Amino acid sequence: MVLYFIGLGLYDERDITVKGLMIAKKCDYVFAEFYTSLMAGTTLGRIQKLIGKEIRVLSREDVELNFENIVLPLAKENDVAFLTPGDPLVATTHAELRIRAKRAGVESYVIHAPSIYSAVGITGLHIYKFGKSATVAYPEGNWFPTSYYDVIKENAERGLHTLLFLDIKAEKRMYMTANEAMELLLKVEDMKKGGVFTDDTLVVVLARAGSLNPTIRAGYVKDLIREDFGDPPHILIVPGKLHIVEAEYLVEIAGAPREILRVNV
Amino acid sequence: MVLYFIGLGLYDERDITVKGLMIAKKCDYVFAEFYTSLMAGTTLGRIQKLIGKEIRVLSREDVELNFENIVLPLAKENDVAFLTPGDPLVATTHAELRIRAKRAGVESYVIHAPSIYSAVGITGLHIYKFGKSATVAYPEGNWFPTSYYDVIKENAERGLHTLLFLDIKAEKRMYMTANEAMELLLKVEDMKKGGVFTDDTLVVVLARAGSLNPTIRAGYVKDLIREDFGDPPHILIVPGKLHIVEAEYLVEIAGAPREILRVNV
Numbered sequence: 001m002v003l004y005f006i007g008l009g010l011y012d013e014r015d016i017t018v019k020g021l022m023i024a025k026k027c028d029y030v031f032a033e034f035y036t037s038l039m040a041g042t043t044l045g046r047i048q049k050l051i052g053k054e055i056r057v058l059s060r061e062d063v064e065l066n067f068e069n070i071v072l073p074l075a076k077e078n079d080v081a082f083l084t085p086g087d088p089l090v091a092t093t094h095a096e097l098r099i100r101a102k103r104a105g106v107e108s109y110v111i112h113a114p115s116i117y118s119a120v121g122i123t124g125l126h127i128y129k130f131g132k133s134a135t136v137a138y139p140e141g142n143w144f145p146t147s148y149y150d151v152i153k154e155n156a157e158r159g160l161h162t163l164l165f166l167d168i169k170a171e172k173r174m175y176m177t178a179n180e181a182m183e184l185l186l187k188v189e190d191m192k193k194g195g196v197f198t199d200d201t202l203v204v205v206l207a208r209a210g211s212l213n214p215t216i217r218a219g220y221v222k223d224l225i226r227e228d229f230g231d232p233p234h235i236l237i238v239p240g241k242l243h244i245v246e247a248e249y250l251v252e253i254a255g256a257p258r259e260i261l262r263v264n265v
Numbered sequence: 266m267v268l269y270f271i272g273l274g275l276y277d278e279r280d281i282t283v284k285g286l287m288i289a290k291k292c293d294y295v296f297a298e299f300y301t302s303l304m305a306g307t308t309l310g311r312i313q314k315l316i317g318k319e320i321r322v323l324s325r326e327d328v329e330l331n332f333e334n335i336v337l338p339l340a341k342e343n344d345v346a347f348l349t350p351g352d353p354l355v356a357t358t359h360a361e362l363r364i365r366a367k368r369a370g371v372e373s374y375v376i377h378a379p380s381i382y383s384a385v386g387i388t389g390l391h392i393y394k395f396g397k398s399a400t401v402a403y404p405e406g407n408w409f410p411t412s413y414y415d416v417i418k419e420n421a422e423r424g425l426h427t428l429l430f431l432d433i434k435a436e437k438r439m440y441m442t443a444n445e446a447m448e449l450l451l452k453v454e455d456m457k458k459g460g461v462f463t464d465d466t467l468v469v470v471l472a473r474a475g476s477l478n479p480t481i482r483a484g485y486v487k488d489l490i491r492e493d494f495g496d497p498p499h500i501l502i503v504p505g506k507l508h509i510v511e512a513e514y515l516v517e518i519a520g521a522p523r524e525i526l527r528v529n530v
Protein backbone atom coordinates (compact mmCIF):
# COMPACT_ATOMS: atom_id res chain seq x y z
CA MET A 1 0.00 0.00 0.00
CA VAL A 2 2.55 2.59 -1.23
CA LEU A 3 3.31 4.45 -4.45
CA TYR A 4 6.68 4.35 -6.25
CA PHE A 5 7.87 7.10 -8.61
CA ILE A 6 10.46 5.23 -10.70
CA GLY A 7 12.67 6.74 -13.36
CA LEU A 8 13.38 4.77 -16.53
CA GLY A 9 16.46 6.64 -17.69
CA LEU A 10 17.68 8.39 -20.82
CA TYR A 11 17.37 6.06 -23.83
CA ASP A 12 16.25 2.44 -23.40
CA GLU A 13 14.68 0.15 -20.83
CA ARG A 14 18.13 -0.61 -19.46
CA ASP A 15 18.85 2.87 -18.16
CA ILE A 16 16.59 1.95 -15.24
CA THR A 17 18.51 1.34 -12.04
CA VAL A 18 18.74 -2.10 -10.64
CA LYS A 19 16.90 -0.72 -7.57
CA GLY A 20 14.07 0.43 -9.79
CA LEU A 21 13.81 -2.84 -11.71
CA MET A 22 13.64 -5.10 -8.68
CA ILE A 23 11.01 -2.92 -7.00
CA ALA A 24 9.03 -2.46 -10.22
CA LYS A 25 9.01 -6.24 -10.61
CA LYS A 26 7.33 -6.57 -7.21
CA CYS A 27 4.65 -3.91 -7.55
CA ASP A 28 1.04 -4.99 -7.94
CA TYR A 29 0.07 -2.30 -10.45
CA VAL A 30 2.27 -0.37 -12.89
CA PHE A 31 1.44 2.96 -14.52
CA ALA A 32 3.53 5.20 -16.78
CA GLU A 33 3.67 8.33 -18.92
CA PHE A 34 5.71 8.98 -22.05
CA TYR A 35 4.85 12.62 -22.74
CA THR A 36 7.44 14.44 -20.60
CA SER A 37 10.31 13.02 -22.68
CA LEU A 38 11.30 10.60 -25.45
CA MET A 39 13.08 7.27 -24.89
CA ALA A 40 14.21 6.72 -28.48
CA GLY A 41 15.83 3.33 -27.98
CA THR A 42 13.01 1.19 -26.58
CA THR A 43 9.31 0.31 -26.79
CA LEU A 44 6.53 -0.19 -24.25
CA GLY A 45 6.75 -3.90 -25.00
CA ARG A 46 10.42 -4.20 -24.07
CA ILE A 47 9.83 -2.30 -20.82
CA GLN A 48 6.88 -4.58 -20.05
CA LYS A 49 8.99 -7.63 -20.88
CA LEU A 50 11.88 -6.48 -18.69
CA ILE A 51 9.71 -5.64 -15.75
CA GLY A 52 7.26 -8.57 -16.16
CA LYS A 53 4.09 -6.46 -15.97
CA GLU A 54 1.55 -4.78 -18.11
CA ILE A 55 2.08 -1.10 -18.10
CA ARG A 56 -0.85 1.10 -18.45
CA VAL A 57 0.19 4.29 -20.06
CA LEU A 58 -1.38 7.56 -18.92
CA SER A 59 -1.89 10.80 -20.84
CA ARG A 60 -0.94 14.27 -19.59
CA GLU A 61 -4.56 14.94 -18.64
CA ASP A 62 -5.00 11.54 -16.94
CA VAL A 63 -2.00 12.53 -14.79
CA GLU A 64 -2.45 16.32 -14.32
CA LEU A 65 -6.18 16.10 -13.68
CA ASN A 66 -7.04 12.47 -12.67
CA PHE A 67 -3.87 11.16 -10.95
CA GLU A 68 -5.71 10.91 -7.62
CA ASN A 69 -8.64 9.14 -9.35
CA ILE A 70 -6.68 6.66 -11.49
CA VAL A 71 -3.48 5.87 -9.60
CA LEU A 72 -3.87 6.92 -5.86
CA PRO A 73 -6.93 4.71 -5.22
CA LEU A 74 -4.99 1.49 -5.96
CA ALA A 75 -2.08 2.58 -3.75
CA LYS A 76 -4.19 2.61 -0.61
CA GLU A 77 -4.41 -1.21 -1.03
CA ASN A 78 -1.58 -2.21 -3.35
CA ASP A 79 1.98 -1.38 -4.18
CA VAL A 80 1.93 0.88 -7.21
CA ALA A 81 4.63 2.20 -9.49
CA PHE A 82 4.50 5.26 -11.74
CA LEU A 83 7.21 5.11 -14.41
CA THR A 84 8.61 8.10 -16.31
CA PRO A 85 11.47 8.76 -18.75
CA GLY A 86 14.74 9.99 -17.23
CA ASP A 87 14.39 11.04 -13.60
CA PRO A 88 10.73 11.43 -12.48
CA LEU A 89 11.10 14.89 -10.91
CA VAL A 90 13.45 16.64 -13.32
CA ALA A 91 11.90 19.34 -15.48
CA THR A 92 8.41 17.97 -14.84
CA THR A 93 5.70 18.81 -12.35
CA HIS A 94 5.52 15.32 -11.04
CA ALA A 95 6.93 16.44 -7.66
CA GLU A 96 3.54 17.99 -7.01
CA LEU A 97 1.95 14.63 -7.31
CA ARG A 98 3.84 13.62 -4.18
CA ILE A 99 1.79 16.20 -2.31
CA ARG A 100 -1.39 14.73 -3.73
CA ALA A 101 -0.24 11.33 -2.63
CA LYS A 102 0.29 12.66 0.88
CA ARG A 103 -3.17 14.22 1.13
CA ALA A 104 -4.73 10.86 0.23
CA GLY A 105 -2.87 9.02 2.98
CA VAL A 106 -0.50 7.32 0.52
CA GLU A 107 3.20 6.96 1.15
CA SER A 108 5.43 7.66 -1.84
CA TYR A 109 9.01 6.83 -2.61
CA VAL A 110 11.31 8.04 -5.38
CA ILE A 111 13.80 5.93 -7.31
CA HIS A 112 16.12 8.07 -9.41
CA ALA A 113 17.54 7.33 -12.83
CA PRO A 114 19.99 8.94 -15.16
CA SER A 115 18.68 12.38 -16.27
CA ILE A 116 19.49 14.63 -19.22
CA TYR A 117 20.33 17.27 -16.62
CA SER A 118 23.45 15.46 -15.40
CA ALA A 119 24.14 13.70 -18.73
CA VAL A 120 25.32 17.04 -20.13
CA GLY A 121 28.58 16.14 -18.52
CA ILE A 122 29.34 13.99 -21.57
CA THR A 123 29.69 17.23 -23.58
CA GLY A 124 32.89 18.07 -21.69
CA LEU A 125 31.41 21.23 -20.20
CA HIS A 126 31.92 21.50 -16.43
CA ILE A 127 28.50 20.82 -14.97
CA TYR A 128 29.02 23.26 -12.10
CA LYS A 129 29.34 26.04 -14.70
CA PHE A 130 25.76 25.63 -15.89
CA GLY A 131 23.43 28.46 -14.96
CA LYS A 132 19.65 28.78 -15.02
CA SER A 133 18.11 26.34 -17.53
CA ALA A 134 15.31 26.98 -20.03
CA THR A 135 12.91 25.39 -22.53
CA VAL A 136 12.62 26.32 -26.22
CA ALA A 137 8.87 26.13 -26.84
CA TYR A 138 7.01 25.81 -30.14
CA PRO A 139 5.16 29.00 -31.12
CA GLU A 140 1.36 28.56 -30.96
CA GLY A 141 -0.92 30.60 -33.22
CA ASN A 142 0.04 34.26 -32.61
CA TRP A 143 1.81 33.72 -29.40
CA PHE A 144 5.64 33.42 -29.76
CA PRO A 145 7.57 32.43 -26.53
CA THR A 146 10.88 34.26 -25.95
CA SER A 147 11.86 33.97 -22.26
CA TYR A 148 14.47 31.29 -22.98
CA TYR A 149 16.34 33.91 -24.97
CA ASP A 150 16.77 36.13 -21.91
CA VAL A 151 17.92 33.14 -19.88
CA ILE A 152 20.85 32.62 -22.24
CA LYS A 153 21.67 36.31 -22.06
CA GLU A 154 21.66 36.33 -18.27
CA ASN A 155 23.88 33.22 -17.99
CA ALA A 156 26.28 34.35 -20.72
CA GLU A 157 26.71 37.70 -18.90
CA ARG A 158 27.95 35.75 -15.99
CA GLY A 159 30.07 33.40 -18.10
CA LEU A 160 27.77 30.41 -17.31
CA HIS A 161 26.59 27.72 -19.76
CA THR A 162 22.91 27.45 -20.64
CA LEU A 163 21.06 24.16 -20.95
CA LEU A 164 18.04 24.31 -23.24
CA PHE A 165 15.47 21.53 -22.99
CA LEU A 166 13.66 21.15 -26.31
CA ASP A 167 9.88 21.16 -26.75
CA ILE A 168 7.74 18.04 -27.21
CA LYS A 169 4.14 17.36 -28.22
CA ALA A 170 4.05 13.55 -27.73
CA GLU A 171 0.40 13.09 -28.73
CA LYS A 172 1.35 14.56 -32.12
CA ARG A 173 4.67 12.72 -32.07
CA MET A 174 6.57 16.01 -32.41
CA TYR A 175 10.08 16.35 -31.04
CA MET A 176 11.87 19.66 -31.59
CA THR A 177 15.31 19.23 -33.13
CA ALA A 178 18.25 21.30 -32.26
CA ASN A 179 18.03 22.55 -35.81
CA GLU A 180 14.49 23.79 -35.06
CA ALA A 181 15.58 25.42 -31.80
CA MET A 182 18.38 27.27 -33.57
CA GLU A 183 15.92 28.71 -36.10
CA LEU A 184 13.51 29.99 -33.46
CA LEU A 185 16.36 31.65 -31.66
CA LEU A 186 17.68 33.44 -34.70
CA LYS A 187 14.19 34.79 -35.21
CA VAL A 188 14.07 35.91 -31.58
CA GLU A 189 17.51 37.51 -31.87
CA ASP A 190 16.36 39.25 -35.03
CA MET A 191 13.38 40.50 -33.04
CA LYS A 192 15.24 41.56 -29.94
CA LYS A 193 18.74 42.31 -31.37
CA GLY A 194 20.68 41.78 -28.14
CA GLY A 195 23.66 40.08 -29.72
CA VAL A 196 22.83 36.96 -27.70
CA PHE A 197 22.35 34.33 -30.40
CA THR A 198 23.72 34.78 -33.95
CA ASP A 199 25.35 32.91 -36.86
CA ASP A 200 28.66 33.18 -34.93
CA THR A 201 27.41 31.83 -31.60
CA LEU A 202 29.06 28.61 -30.46
CA VAL A 203 26.57 25.92 -29.46
CA VAL A 204 26.68 22.26 -28.49
CA VAL A 205 24.21 19.60 -29.51
CA LEU A 206 23.65 16.39 -27.60
CA ALA A 207 21.25 13.91 -29.19
CA ARG A 208 20.03 10.59 -27.83
CA ALA A 209 22.07 10.73 -24.62
CA GLY A 210 22.05 7.35 -22.94
CA SER A 211 22.56 5.39 -26.14
CA LEU A 212 26.06 4.04 -26.69
CA ASN A 213 26.62 6.28 -29.69
CA PRO A 214 24.98 9.61 -28.90
CA THR A 215 25.56 12.46 -31.30
CA ILE A 216 27.73 15.12 -29.70
CA ARG A 217 28.58 18.15 -31.82
CA ALA A 218 29.98 21.60 -31.09
CA GLY A 219 30.31 24.53 -33.47
CA TYR A 220 29.06 27.81 -34.85
CA VAL A 221 25.35 28.14 -35.57
CA LYS A 222 25.93 29.02 -39.22
CA ASP A 223 27.70 25.65 -39.58
CA LEU A 224 25.33 23.52 -37.37
CA ILE A 225 21.81 24.93 -38.01
CA ARG A 226 21.40 22.57 -40.99
CA GLU A 227 23.49 19.61 -39.94
CA ASP A 228 21.70 16.34 -39.33
CA PHE A 229 22.06 15.24 -35.72
CA GLY A 230 19.98 12.07 -36.02
CA ASP A 231 16.63 11.21 -34.49
CA PRO A 232 15.28 13.01 -31.40
CA PRO A 233 15.54 13.70 -28.54
CA HIS A 234 18.00 16.60 -28.74
CA ILE A 235 18.95 19.38 -26.40
CA LEU A 236 20.94 22.34 -27.14
CA ILE A 237 23.46 24.14 -25.00
CA VAL A 238 24.87 27.64 -25.36
CA PRO A 239 28.22 27.64 -23.49
CA GLY A 240 29.46 30.74 -21.65
CA LYS A 241 33.06 31.30 -21.56
CA LEU A 242 35.08 28.24 -21.81
CA HIS A 243 37.83 26.72 -19.71
CA ILE A 244 40.76 25.45 -21.76
CA VAL A 245 40.05 21.75 -21.08
CA GLU A 246 36.38 22.26 -22.05
CA ALA A 247 37.39 23.67 -25.40
CA GLU A 248 39.92 20.81 -25.90
CA TYR A 249 37.20 18.25 -25.22
CA LEU A 250 34.80 20.00 -27.59
CA VAL A 251 37.39 19.91 -30.37
CA GLU A 252 38.72 16.39 -29.63
CA ILE A 253 35.39 14.62 -28.82
CA ALA A 254 32.64 16.79 -30.31
CA GLY A 255 34.45 17.79 -33.51
CA ALA A 256 34.38 21.56 -32.92
CA PRO A 257 36.41 23.98 -35.11
CA ARG A 258 40.00 23.73 -33.84
CA GLU A 259 40.00 27.49 -33.27
CA ILE A 260 37.73 27.51 -30.30
CA LEU A 261 40.95 26.20 -28.78
CA ARG A 262 41.81 29.84 -28.60
CA VAL A 263 39.92 31.07 -25.62
CA ASN A 264 39.52 34.80 -25.08
CA VAL A 265 39.99 34.97 -21.34
CA MET B 266 39.90 -2.21 -27.28
CA VAL B 267 37.01 -0.61 -25.32
CA LEU B 268 36.80 1.47 -22.12
CA TYR B 269 33.45 1.85 -20.37
CA PHE B 270 32.92 4.80 -18.02
CA ILE B 271 30.18 3.42 -15.80
CA GLY B 272 28.34 5.41 -13.17
CA LEU B 273 27.50 3.71 -9.90
CA GLY B 274 24.62 5.99 -8.96
CA LEU B 275 23.75 7.69 -5.66
CA TYR B 276 23.76 5.55 -2.51
CA ASP B 277 24.13 1.76 -2.73
CA GLU B 278 25.19 -1.08 -5.08
CA ARG B 279 21.75 -1.21 -6.71
CA ASP B 280 21.93 2.42 -7.86
CA ILE B 281 23.95 1.29 -10.91
CA THR B 282 21.75 0.95 -14.02
CA VAL B 283 20.84 -2.38 -15.49
CA LYS B 284 22.85 -1.36 -18.56
CA GLY B 285 25.85 -0.60 -16.39
CA LEU B 286 25.82 -3.84 -14.44
CA MET B 287 25.48 -6.05 -17.55
CA ILE B 288 28.31 -4.23 -19.33
CA ALA B 289 30.46 -4.46 -16.19
CA LYS B 290 29.87 -8.22 -15.84
CA LYS B 291 31.28 -8.69 -19.34
CA CYS B 292 34.44 -6.61 -18.89
CA ASP B 293 37.78 -8.37 -18.42
CA TYR B 294 38.95 -5.72 -15.97
CA VAL B 295 37.13 -3.41 -13.58
CA PHE B 296 38.51 -0.30 -11.93
CA ALA B 297 36.80 2.16 -9.59
CA GLU B 298 37.58 5.32 -7.64
CA PHE B 299 36.08 6.60 -4.41
CA TYR B 300 37.97 9.82 -3.92
CA THR B 301 35.47 12.18 -5.62
CA SER B 302 32.78 10.65 -3.42
CA LEU B 303 31.88 7.54 -1.45
CA MET B 304 28.80 5.34 -1.59
CA ALA B 305 27.71 5.58 2.05
CA GLY B 306 24.96 3.00 1.61
CA THR B 307 27.13 0.12 0.58
CA THR B 308 30.72 -1.31 0.49
CA LEU B 309 33.29 -2.24 -1.99
CA GLY B 310 32.61 -5.84 -1.02
CA ARG B 311 28.93 -5.60 -1.83
CA ILE B 312 29.68 -3.84 -5.11
CA GLN B 313 32.10 -6.58 -6.09
CA LYS B 314 29.62 -9.33 -5.16
CA LEU B 315 26.92 -7.80 -7.29
CA ILE B 316 29.21 -7.37 -10.30
CA GLY B 317 30.96 -10.68 -9.78
CA LYS B 318 34.32 -9.17 -10.70
CA GLU B 319 37.22 -8.19 -8.48
CA ILE B 320 37.41 -4.40 -8.37
CA ARG B 321 40.76 -2.71 -8.24
CA VAL B 322 40.50 0.58 -6.60
CA LEU B 323 42.33 3.63 -7.88
CA SER B 324 43.49 6.70 -5.92
CA ARG B 325 43.22 10.29 -7.08
CA GLU B 326 46.85 10.26 -8.17
CA ASP B 327 46.36 6.91 -9.94
CA VAL B 328 43.69 8.58 -12.07
CA GLU B 329 44.83 12.19 -12.61
CA LEU B 330 48.50 11.32 -13.05
CA ASN B 331 48.62 7.74 -14.42
CA PHE B 332 45.24 6.86 -16.00
CA GLU B 333 47.12 6.19 -19.26
CA ASN B 334 49.61 3.76 -17.71
CA ILE B 335 47.26 1.83 -15.40
CA VAL B 336 43.85 1.70 -17.16
CA LEU B 337 44.33 2.47 -20.88
CA PRO B 338 46.97 -0.24 -21.64
CA LEU B 339 44.55 -2.98 -20.54
CA ALA B 340 41.78 -1.38 -22.60
CA LYS B 341 43.77 -1.97 -25.80
CA GLU B 342 43.33 -5.79 -25.75
CA ASN B 343 40.35 -6.19 -23.40
CA ASP B 344 37.07 -4.60 -22.38
CA VAL B 345 37.75 -2.38 -19.36
CA ALA B 346 35.29 -0.75 -16.98
CA PHE B 347 35.96 2.37 -14.90
CA LEU B 348 33.42 2.85 -12.11
CA THR B 349 32.71 6.20 -10.49
CA PRO B 350 30.06 7.18 -7.90
CA GLY B 351 27.10 9.07 -9.38
CA ASP B 352 27.05 9.90 -13.07
CA PRO B 353 30.34 9.55 -14.98
CA LEU B 354 31.98 12.82 -16.21
CA VAL B 355 30.17 14.94 -13.62
CA ALA B 356 33.39 15.33 -11.63
CA THR B 357 35.10 18.30 -13.27
CA THR B 358 38.39 16.50 -14.29
CA HIS B 359 36.83 13.24 -15.63
CA ALA B 360 35.73 14.35 -19.15
CA GLU B 361 39.45 14.93 -20.01
CA LEU B 362 40.01 11.24 -19.38
CA ARG B 363 38.15 10.55 -22.58
CA ILE B 364 40.69 12.63 -24.46
CA ARG B 365 43.48 10.54 -23.01
CA ALA B 366 41.72 7.43 -24.27
CA LYS B 367 41.34 8.88 -27.76
CA ARG B 368 45.05 9.76 -27.73
CA ALA B 369 45.83 6.14 -26.80
CA GLY B 370 43.70 4.84 -29.67
CA VAL B 371 41.12 3.47 -27.19
CA GLU B 372 37.36 3.62 -27.79
CA SER B 373 35.32 4.90 -24.82
CA TYR B 374 31.63 4.75 -24.04
CA VAL B 375 29.71 6.35 -21.21
CA ILE B 376 27.03 4.56 -19.23
CA HIS B 377 25.08 7.12 -17.18
CA ALA B 378 23.62 6.63 -13.75
CA PRO B 379 21.82 8.92 -11.28
CA SER B 380 23.61 12.08 -10.09
CA ILE B 381 22.95 14.40 -7.15
CA TYR B 382 22.61 17.24 -9.71
CA SER B 383 19.31 15.74 -10.89
CA ALA B 384 18.43 13.75 -7.72
CA VAL B 385 17.87 17.07 -5.75
CA GLY B 386 14.73 17.28 -7.68
CA ILE B 387 13.36 15.28 -4.76
CA THR B 388 13.54 18.48 -2.69
CA GLY B 389 10.63 19.78 -4.75
CA LEU B 390 12.75 22.67 -6.06
CA HIS B 391 12.40 23.24 -9.82
CA ILE B 392 15.54 22.10 -11.62
CA TYR B 393 15.55 24.89 -14.21
CA LYS B 394 15.85 27.36 -11.31
CA PHE B 395 19.22 26.04 -10.13
CA GLY B 396 22.08 28.40 -10.90
CA LYS B 397 25.84 28.07 -10.69
CA SER B 398 26.96 25.30 -8.33
CA ALA B 399 29.70 25.34 -5.73
CA THR B 400 31.57 23.49 -3.01
CA VAL B 401 31.87 24.66 0.60
CA ALA B 402 35.50 24.15 1.59
CA TYR B 403 37.12 23.95 5.03
CA PRO B 404 39.32 27.00 5.74
CA GLU B 405 42.86 25.98 6.73
CA GLY B 406 46.03 27.67 7.86
CA ASN B 407 46.17 31.21 6.50
CA TRP B 408 43.69 30.32 3.77
CA PHE B 409 40.04 31.28 4.11
CA PRO B 410 38.21 30.75 0.77
CA THR B 411 34.75 32.31 0.31
CA SER B 412 33.90 31.94 -3.39
CA TYR B 413 30.98 29.60 -2.61
CA TYR B 414 29.50 32.55 -0.72
CA ASP B 415 29.64 34.85 -3.77
CA VAL B 416 28.06 32.08 -5.82
CA ILE B 417 25.03 32.03 -3.51
CA LYS B 418 24.80 35.82 -3.75
CA GLU B 419 24.89 35.99 -7.59
CA ASN B 420 22.33 33.14 -7.82
CA ALA B 421 19.82 34.29 -5.17
CA GLU B 422 20.24 37.76 -6.72
CA ARG B 423 18.63 36.39 -9.86
CA GLY B 424 16.00 34.27 -8.10
CA LEU B 425 18.04 31.09 -8.64
CA HIS B 426 18.73 28.18 -6.27
CA THR B 427 22.29 27.31 -5.16
CA LEU B 428 23.38 23.68 -4.86
CA LEU B 429 26.24 23.34 -2.38
CA PHE B 430 28.50 20.32 -2.27
CA LEU B 431 30.19 19.93 1.09
CA ASP B 432 33.89 19.25 1.68
CA ILE B 433 34.95 15.60 1.86
CA LYS B 434 38.16 14.10 2.80
CA ALA B 435 37.44 10.73 0.96
CA GLU B 436 40.53 8.83 2.17
CA LYS B 437 39.98 9.68 5.86
CA ARG B 438 36.26 9.14 5.32
CA MET B 439 35.61 12.62 6.84
CA TYR B 440 32.46 14.50 5.69
CA MET B 441 31.55 18.10 6.29
CA THR B 442 28.08 18.12 7.85
CA ALA B 443 25.29 20.43 6.79
CA ASN B 444 25.58 21.86 10.32
CA GLU B 445 29.25 22.70 9.83
CA ALA B 446 28.55 24.23 6.41
CA MET B 447 25.90 26.47 7.94
CA GLU B 448 28.18 27.73 10.66
CA LEU B 449 30.96 28.35 8.15
CA LEU B 450 28.66 30.43 5.99
CA LEU B 451 27.43 32.29 9.02
CA LYS B 452 31.03 33.01 9.75
CA VAL B 453 31.62 34.08 6.15
CA GLU B 454 28.58 36.37 6.37
CA ASP B 455 30.03 38.12 9.41
CA MET B 456 33.10 38.74 7.26
CA LYS B 457 31.57 40.11 4.07
CA LYS B 458 28.30 41.34 5.62
CA GLY B 459 26.64 41.00 2.23
CA GLY B 460 23.33 39.93 3.73
CA VAL B 461 23.56 36.64 1.84
CA PHE B 462 23.44 34.00 4.59
CA THR B 463 21.99 34.68 8.06
CA ASP B 464 19.95 33.06 10.82
CA ASP B 465 16.87 33.99 8.80
CA THR B 466 17.98 32.43 5.54
CA LEU B 467 15.99 29.48 4.43
CA VAL B 468 17.88 26.36 3.48
CA VAL B 469 17.20 22.83 2.39
CA VAL B 470 19.22 19.84 3.54
CA LEU B 471 19.25 16.60 1.55
CA ALA B 472 20.96 13.57 3.01
CA ARG B 473 21.47 10.10 1.57
CA ALA B 474 19.71 10.89 -1.67
CA GLY B 475 19.08 7.61 -3.44
CA SER B 476 18.20 5.55 -0.40
CA LEU B 477 14.50 4.73 -0.09
CA ASN B 478 14.41 6.84 3.07
CA PRO B 479 16.35 10.04 2.36
CA THR B 480 16.30 12.91 4.84
CA ILE B 481 14.77 16.04 3.30
CA ARG B 482 14.51 19.04 5.60
CA ALA B 483 13.81 22.71 5.00
CA GLY B 484 13.76 25.66 7.35
CA TYR B 485 15.47 28.76 8.64
CA VAL B 486 19.11 28.44 9.64
CA LYS B 487 18.43 29.39 13.28
CA ASP B 488 16.32 26.21 13.62
CA LEU B 489 18.35 23.82 11.43
CA ILE B 490 21.96 24.77 12.21
CA ARG B 491 21.80 22.53 15.27
CA GLU B 492 19.46 19.81 13.98
CA ASP B 493 20.59 16.22 13.39
CA PHE B 494 20.19 15.19 9.74
CA GLY B 495 21.55 11.65 10.18
CA ASP B 496 24.59 10.03 8.59
CA PRO B 497 26.42 11.68 5.66
CA PRO B 498 26.79 12.63 3.02
CA HIS B 499 24.95 15.94 3.30
CA ILE B 500 24.03 18.34 0.53
CA LEU B 501 23.09 21.96 1.32
CA ILE B 502 20.86 24.13 -0.84
CA VAL B 503 20.18 27.83 -0.46
CA PRO B 504 16.98 28.47 -2.48
CA GLY B 505 16.23 31.73 -4.25
CA LYS B 506 12.70 33.13 -4.09
CA LEU B 507 10.28 30.19 -4.24
CA HIS B 508 7.44 29.38 -6.63
CA ILE B 509 4.37 28.71 -4.46
CA VAL B 510 4.35 25.05 -5.58
CA GLU B 511 7.94 24.62 -4.41
CA ALA B 512 7.03 26.07 -1.01
CA GLU B 513 4.04 23.78 -0.62
CA TYR B 514 6.28 20.78 -1.30
CA LEU B 515 8.91 21.84 1.24
CA VAL B 516 6.10 22.27 3.79
CA GLU B 517 4.21 19.04 3.08
CA ILE B 518 7.18 16.78 2.29
CA ALA B 519 10.27 18.35 3.92
CA GLY B 520 8.52 19.60 7.06
CA ALA B 521 9.26 23.27 6.36
CA PRO B 522 7.50 25.89 8.53
CA ARG B 523 4.20 27.38 7.28
CA GLU B 524 5.91 30.73 7.53
CA ILE B 525 7.71 30.15 4.20
CA LEU B 526 4.42 30.13 2.30
CA ARG B 527 4.28 33.89 2.81
CA VAL B 528 7.89 34.88 3.61
CA ASN B 529 9.90 33.17 0.85
CA VAL B 530 7.31 33.33 -1.96
Ligand SMILES: Nc1ncnc2c1ncn2[C@@H]1O[C@H](CSCC[C@H](N)C(=O)O)[C@@H](O)[C@H]1O
Nearest residue numbers: 037086087090115116165166208209233234
Ligand atom coordinates in the same frame (compact mmCIF):
# COMPACT_ATOMS: atom_id res chain seq x y z
N1 LIG C 1 18.43 11.12 -23.93
C1 LIG C 1 18.23 12.41 -24.22
N2 LIG C 1 19.01 13.06 -25.14
C2 LIG C 1 18.85 14.37 -25.47
N3 LIG C 1 17.88 15.18 -24.91
C3 LIG C 1 17.10 14.54 -23.99
C4 LIG C 1 17.20 13.23 -23.61
N4 LIG C 1 16.21 12.92 -22.63
C5 LIG C 1 15.57 14.04 -22.46
N5 LIG C 1 16.02 15.10 -23.24
C6 LIG C 1 15.62 16.46 -23.38
O1 LIG C 1 14.67 16.88 -22.29
C7 LIG C 1 13.33 17.07 -22.80
C8 LIG C 1 12.33 16.36 -21.81
S1 LIG C 1 12.37 17.24 -20.31
C9 LIG C 1 12.08 15.93 -19.04
C10 LIG C 1 13.44 15.40 -18.59
C11 LIG C 1 13.51 14.14 -17.78
N6 LIG C 1 12.75 14.10 -16.46
C12 LIG C 1 15.02 13.78 -17.42
O2 LIG C 1 15.32 13.56 -16.22
O3 LIG C 1 15.87 13.73 -18.41
C13 LIG C 1 13.31 16.56 -24.19
O4 LIG C 1 12.32 17.23 -24.96
C14 LIG C 1 14.77 16.81 -24.65
O5 LIG C 1 15.00 18.12 -25.16
